[PDB]
Amino acid sequence: MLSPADKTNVKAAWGKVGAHAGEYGAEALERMFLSFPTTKTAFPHFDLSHGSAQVKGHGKKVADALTNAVAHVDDMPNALSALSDLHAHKLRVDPVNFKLLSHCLLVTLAAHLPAEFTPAVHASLDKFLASVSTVLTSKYR
Amino acid sequence: MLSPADKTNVKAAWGKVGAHAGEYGAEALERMFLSFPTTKTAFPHFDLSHGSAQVKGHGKKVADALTNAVAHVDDMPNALSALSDLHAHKLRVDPVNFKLLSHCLLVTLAAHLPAEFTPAVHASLDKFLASVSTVLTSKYR
Amino acid sequence: VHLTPEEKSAVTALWGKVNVDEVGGEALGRLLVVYPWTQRFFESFGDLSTPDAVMGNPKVKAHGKKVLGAFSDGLAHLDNLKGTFATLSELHCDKLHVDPENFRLLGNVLVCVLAHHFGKEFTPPVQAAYQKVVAGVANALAHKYH
Amino acid sequence: VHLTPEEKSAVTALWGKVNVDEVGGEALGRLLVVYPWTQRFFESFGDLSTPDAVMGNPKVKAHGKKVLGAFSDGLAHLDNLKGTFATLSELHCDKLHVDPENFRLLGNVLVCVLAHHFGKEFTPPVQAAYQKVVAGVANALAHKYH
Ligand code: HEM
Ligand code: HEM
Ligand code: HEM
Ligand code: HEM
């Protein structure tokens, strides 16, 4: 459960991201594929090489979705309803993978936000990404 | 989310358990400790040998709680309030152990309920036990 | 995998009573039922929309026999699972694109199915030994992923 | 753990610039703040109820130097982590009763502290090399659990 402090913290950190949101999404994906190679099994159609437009493209879509979640942080389940249906019934990615991409997003943020990534903010962002994950996997069975 | 079918299946399976609830709880712990030895680090004050009084007593408490949860399936966060509090703020067992004990409870139920442990019912129990774990760890942070 | 000679014997003695054909279909079928997202790899098999459809599907039953027959061979070589499953590991990574978490889930479903089949004979120590086996097989099947 | 030669160079190069004391204390404090249940092992350290309290506790800072100093010594023995950490593994199991999952969570926290501190120099390949190292250290600390 996010507390108001958590929400505050996420809105601030994500705001400093701004227009780079898509760029970070892409770097997180690339970090995930190199660090946790089993995650490539979920993108067998993608060119996964460094600089891949497919990767950059998909990174932008992930980032835009997170941007929407932060805006609708009090009502994420209806806000992400199309995504959660799509993940549960079409994509069917294994749920452990969500934890991996989340760790990688956190690493990406930390590498870009020296000043804003304090322990408190790190804790809120971890809870935030865990809630998103939980929403995205809520309709799997 | 538990469907009405899930709730019916769980209620039927647990009813069959009936008066053996405590015996099954102790068995599940013993299965857990021998299959997943890291779980013993949560019980350093216990005598863990086969048939110990502490394991038998703890298995009955565990089982009683699950029985209460079944009876309050539509109202579990409230029914398990004291237990969520206790685990989150005093015991603090890592969340990963709840799936280990959940597996062991399912194995135990399988070993005791030949006619009832159909695929549909297996699915319902697994969902139910994941829901209970979710509630028990819901106040960890 | 490190099992004791008393664990190895307990494993082999039970397995001799297993009809791998029956058990294989049941294990694969339950996997698809309990954990619906695994159905993604089996679209070519036809209808898997309900439990009855899955458990009745002849391709699921046939596939389960292959998987468990391959598991059964692996029990003869507990000391070198890596070697026995090397080709299969590469196949599951490079051709089938199967997330190795699925091997773990299948392992756990198999244990439930054995417990169901054998009842009180599937004692805590016997279960402990099969948990080591199934983890060993999953790690061996994941070893060539890259 | 097997690291390729460029991985070993990357790992050693970044580490030569790390101040263990400081990094140690941050990694352990962030652990205690992000995953508060890990606070159970350190009741004797004092009040750990707010981030500020945790990050400025001298007993957290000290233990964090101890932990990362041992980790440091392991970097020098990447080809035999199991041996190097066997006595510590036994201690953590038999005396401290620490669940090995905690070693995994500390490793990931450490990765985020390295990224925070080194910025763009903590590249995706460098991260990947450190992820192998932290998993290998966690597996070594967990190996003697029984
Ligand atoms: C932070 C959590 C995640 C969010 C917010 C997210 C969001 C999205 C979005 C917005 C799309 C595009 C849907 C569309 O284009 O209409 C998508 C698709 C997809 N996602 Fe997720 N995703 C997440 C995690 C994951 C993870 C963990 C995986 C597995 C590793 C995954 C695998 C996929 C795949 C394979 C697609 C389809 C890509 C394509 O073919 O273009 N996603 N996701
Ligand atoms: C099925 C989910 C679980 C339920 C329903 C459950 C329920 C309970 C109950 C009823 C108690 C006794 C509380 C009292 O003193 O009144 C308890 C205590 C405890 N639980 Fe949980 N528990 C669950 C899972 C776990 C897990 C996975 C662990 C860690 C492996 C764990 C560790 C403990 C410990 C160490 C105690 C204290 C025992 C003592 O000191 O006497 N529990 N639990
Ligand atoms: C004990 C673990 C497993 C073993 C030993 C195993 C073994 C096998 C074998 C022997 C084949 C046939 C290879 C060939 O000659 O083409 C196969 C194919 C296959 N396996 Fe695995 N398997 C395991 C688990 C899994 C699971 C968990 C999944 C997915 C959830 C999976 C998905 C597949 C698929 C999709 C095929 C191809 C089927 C086709 O021809 O359409 N396997 N496996
Ligand atoms: C990188 C992994 C870790 C390493 C290398 C490590 C290393 C050490 C060392 C060298 C000691 C001193 C042992 C002695 O007195 O002889 C120690 C003690 C201890 N560690 Fe670990 N540690 C690790 C992770 C953890 C974490 C994750 C936890 C729990 C969150 C933990 C809990 C403790 C505790 C409670 C002590 C005893 C403290 C005391 O007596 O003041 N350790 N560790």
Short mmCIF file of C-alpha atoms in Angstrom, two decimals, chain C:
data_model
loop_
_atom_site.label_atom_id
_atom_site.label_comp_id
_atom_site.label_asym_id
_atom_site.label_seq_id
_atom_site.Cartn_x
_atom_site.Cartn_y
_atom_site.Cartn_z
CA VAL C 1 22.42 -33.31 -7.59
CA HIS C 2 23.46 -34.44 -4.16
CA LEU C 3 21.07 -37.07 -2.89
CA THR C 4 22.05 -39.59 -0.27
CA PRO C 5 22.01 -43.29 -1.24
CA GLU C 6 19.02 -43.64 1.03
CA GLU C 7 17.32 -40.76 -0.81
CA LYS C 8 18.24 -42.18 -4.21
CA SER C 9 16.81 -45.51 -3.24
CA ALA C 10 13.64 -44.01 -1.95
CA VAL C 11 13.21 -42.10 -5.24
CA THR C 12 13.82 -45.10 -7.50
CA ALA C 13 11.66 -47.44 -5.47
CA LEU C 14 8.66 -45.15 -5.87
CA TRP C 15 9.21 -44.33 -9.51
CA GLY C 16 9.03 -48.11 -10.40
CA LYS C 17 5.35 -47.91 -9.49
CA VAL C 18 4.61 -44.90 -11.66
CA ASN C 19 2.76 -45.34 -14.97
CA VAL C 20 4.67 -42.54 -16.72
CA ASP C 21 2.07 -42.36 -19.42
CA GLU C 22 -0.77 -41.60 -16.94
CA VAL C 23 1.33 -39.33 -14.70
CA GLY C 24 2.80 -37.35 -17.54
CA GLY C 25 -0.60 -36.30 -18.97
CA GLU C 26 -1.99 -35.47 -15.56
CA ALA C 27 1.10 -33.37 -14.64
CA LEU C 28 1.14 -31.40 -17.89
CA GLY C 29 -2.64 -30.98 -17.77
CA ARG C 30 -2.65 -29.67 -14.20
CA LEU C 31 0.15 -27.29 -15.08
CA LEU C 32 -2.06 -25.74 -17.81
CA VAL C 33 -5.04 -25.62 -15.50
CA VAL C 34 -3.47 -24.25 -12.27
CA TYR C 35 -1.22 -21.86 -14.03
CA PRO C 36 -3.16 -20.72 -17.18
CA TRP C 37 -0.42 -18.55 -18.65
CA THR C 38 1.61 -21.64 -19.53
CA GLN C 39 -1.03 -22.26 -22.22
CA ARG C 40 0.85 -19.79 -24.42
CA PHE C 41 3.26 -22.44 -25.57
CA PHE C 42 0.57 -24.84 -26.59
CA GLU C 43 -1.70 -22.92 -28.97
CA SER C 44 -1.09 -25.53 -31.67
CA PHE C 45 -2.72 -28.13 -29.43
CA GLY C 46 -6.25 -26.90 -29.79
CA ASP C 47 -8.85 -26.04 -27.20
CA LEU C 48 -7.56 -25.37 -23.67
CA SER C 49 -10.32 -22.99 -22.49
CA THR C 50 -11.66 -25.14 -19.65
CA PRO C 51 -10.25 -27.71 -17.27
CA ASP C 52 -12.21 -30.44 -18.97
CA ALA C 53 -10.95 -29.40 -22.34
CA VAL C 54 -7.32 -29.43 -21.14
CA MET C 55 -7.45 -32.66 -19.28
CA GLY C 56 -9.21 -34.33 -22.20
CA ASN C 57 -6.98 -32.98 -24.97
CA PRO C 58 -5.09 -35.86 -26.68
CA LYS C 59 -2.10 -33.68 -27.65
CA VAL C 60 -1.65 -32.66 -24.02
CA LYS C 61 -1.68 -36.29 -23.03
CA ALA C 62 0.75 -37.26 -25.75
CA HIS C 63 3.05 -34.33 -24.92
CA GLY C 64 3.02 -35.20 -21.24
CA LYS C 65 4.26 -38.71 -22.01
CA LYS C 66 7.28 -37.36 -23.90
CA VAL C 67 8.17 -34.89 -21.13
CA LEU C 68 7.90 -37.39 -18.33
CA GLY C 69 9.67 -40.12 -20.37
CA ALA C 70 12.54 -37.67 -20.72
CA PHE C 71 12.29 -37.02 -16.94
CA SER C 72 12.37 -40.73 -16.29
CA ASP C 73 15.61 -41.18 -18.27
CA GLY C 74 17.12 -38.43 -16.14
CA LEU C 75 16.52 -40.47 -12.99
CA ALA C 76 19.11 -42.98 -14.19
CA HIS C 77 21.77 -40.33 -14.13
CA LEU C 78 21.10 -38.25 -11.09
CA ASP C 79 24.82 -37.66 -10.88
CA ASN C 80 24.97 -35.99 -14.32
CA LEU C 81 21.72 -34.25 -15.05
CA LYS C 82 23.53 -31.41 -16.80
CA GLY C 83 24.90 -33.83 -19.34
CA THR C 84 21.66 -35.71 -19.94
CA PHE C 85 19.60 -32.57 -20.55
CA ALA C 86 22.15 -30.39 -22.44
CA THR C 87 20.53 -30.71 -25.81
CA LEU C 88 17.05 -30.35 -24.41
CA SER C 89 18.17 -27.16 -22.57
CA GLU C 90 19.40 -25.57 -25.82
CA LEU C 91 16.21 -26.64 -27.59
CA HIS C 92 14.02 -25.04 -24.93
CA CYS C 93 15.99 -21.78 -25.09
CA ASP C 94 16.83 -21.27 -28.79
CA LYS C 95 13.87 -22.93 -30.45
CA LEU C 96 10.96 -22.97 -28.04
CA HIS C 97 11.71 -19.79 -26.05
CA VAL C 98 10.38 -21.29 -22.78
CA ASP C 99 11.02 -19.36 -19.58
CA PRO C 100 12.89 -21.67 -17.21
CA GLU C 101 10.46 -20.67 -14.39
CA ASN C 102 8.05 -23.09 -16.10
CA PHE C 103 10.30 -26.04 -15.32
CA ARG C 104 10.00 -25.16 -11.64
CA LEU C 105 6.25 -24.89 -11.77
CA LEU C 106 6.03 -28.24 -13.53
CA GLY C 107 8.27 -29.74 -10.82
CA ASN C 108 5.93 -28.61 -8.11
CA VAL C 109 2.84 -29.88 -9.93
CA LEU C 110 4.55 -33.23 -10.40
CA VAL C 111 5.18 -33.48 -6.67
CA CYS C 112 1.52 -32.73 -5.99
CA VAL C 113 0.52 -35.37 -8.48
CA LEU C 114 2.77 -37.98 -6.88
CA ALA C 115 1.35 -37.10 -3.46
CA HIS C 116 -2.13 -37.47 -4.83
CA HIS C 117 -1.38 -40.83 -6.46
CA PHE C 118 0.51 -42.45 -3.64
CA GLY C 119 -1.08 -40.94 -0.59
CA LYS C 120 0.53 -41.85 2.74
CA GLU C 121 3.45 -43.63 1.02
CA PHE C 122 4.62 -40.17 -0.19
CA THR C 123 6.09 -39.38 3.18
CA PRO C 124 7.84 -36.16 4.14
CA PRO C 125 11.39 -37.62 3.57
CA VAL C 126 10.40 -39.12 0.19
CA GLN C 127 8.94 -35.72 -0.79
CA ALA C 128 12.15 -34.05 0.29
CA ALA C 129 14.11 -36.29 -1.99
CA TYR C 130 11.79 -35.65 -4.99
CA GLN C 131 12.03 -31.89 -4.30
CA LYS C 132 15.77 -32.17 -4.76
CA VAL C 133 15.31 -34.13 -7.99
CA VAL C 134 12.85 -31.72 -9.51
CA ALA C 135 15.06 -28.71 -8.65
CA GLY C 136 18.01 -30.51 -10.17
CA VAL C 137 16.17 -31.21 -13.38
CA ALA C 138 14.99 -27.61 -13.63
CA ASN C 139 18.51 -26.23 -13.13
CA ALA C 140 19.89 -28.67 -15.73
CA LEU C 141 17.21 -27.66 -18.24
CA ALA C 142 18.10 -23.98 -17.69
CA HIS C 143 21.91 -24.38 -17.87
CA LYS C 144 22.40 -23.65 -21.62
CA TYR C 145 20.19 -20.51 -21.64
CA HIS C 146 21.92 -17.38 -22.86
#
